[PDB]
Every structure is written in structure tokens, then in C-alpha cells.
Amino acid sequence: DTSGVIKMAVKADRRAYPAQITPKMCLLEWCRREKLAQPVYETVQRPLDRLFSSIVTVAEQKYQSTLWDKSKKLAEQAAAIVCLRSQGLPEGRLGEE
């Protein structure tokens, strides 16, 4: 139910333009709207490879990509995508009310 880790093969990409909606923004809005504690990101490293991964915790469930990134920032975005994408949520859409 809320134990272990949910995983997806996700590699995040850099922002195409500075005003782009990122998966991290979508995950904050979702947690806000669902009345959940904000996401908690935890960095995992493979220093010999200069590799990074991130585990994101949302509603007591851990989320993580199956892929490592050279960027800590991109690994956090990848963890956010797995969280959204595995739940059927949009990763580039926010509400204007």
C-alpha cells in the first residue's frame, strides 16, 4: 500500500525555456490540493560514477526513477515525474483558478 519504492524509467530534461512548468511545481500543487505534507526529496549517490538519484516521499509512499543522472537537480525532477506519471497526473500543467 504505502511501503517500499514505486519506480519508472524516467530521465528528466532541462527546462526548454525559463518560464516552463517543471514536474516539481506540479507535485507541490498536487500536494497542496490533496492537503498533503509537501514532497520530501532525498539524494542517493554513486560517487565513483558522479551519479545521482533522488527518492521523493509523498503521502508516506517513496518514488524513484530506475535511471541515474549526472545532475542532482535533474534527478529530483525525475523523482517528481515518477510520482506524478505513476499516479496518472499531469507533469506540465498547473491551475489558474
UniProtKB/Swiss-Prot annotation:
Tissue specificity as recorded in UniProt: Weak expression in heart, placenta and skeletal muscle. Up-regulated in most lung cancer cells (at protein level).
Domain of life according to the entry: Eukaryota
Result for mutant: Q20A: Mildly decreased affinity for tRNA
Region listing for Interaction with tRNA, in residue ranges: 20-24, 73-77
Domain DRBM, first and last residues per copy: 22-89
Subcellular locations according to the entry: Cytoplasm; Endoplasmic reticulum
Effect of K73A: Decreased affinity for tRNA. Strongly decreased affinity for tRNA
Effect of R32A: Mildly decreased affinity for tRNA
Residues that span the membrane, as ranges: none
Stated family: Belongs to the Dus family. Dus2 subfamily.
Domain notes: Efficient dihydrouridine synthesis requires the presence of both the catalytic domain and the C-terminal RNA-binding DRBM domain.
Purpose: Catalyzes the NADPH-dependent synthesis of dihydrouridine, a modified base found in the D-loop of most tRNAs. Specifically modifies U20 in cytoplasmic tRNAs. Activity depends on the presence of guanosine at position 19 in the tRNA substrate. Negatively regulates the activation of EIF2AK2/PKR.
Assembly, per entry: Interacts with EPRS1. Interacts (via DRBM domain) with PRKRA and EIF2AK2/PKR (via DRBM 1 domain).
Name of the protein: tRNA-dihydrouridine(20) synthase [NAD(P)+]-like
Species assigned in the record: Homo sapiens
Gene behind this protein: DUS2
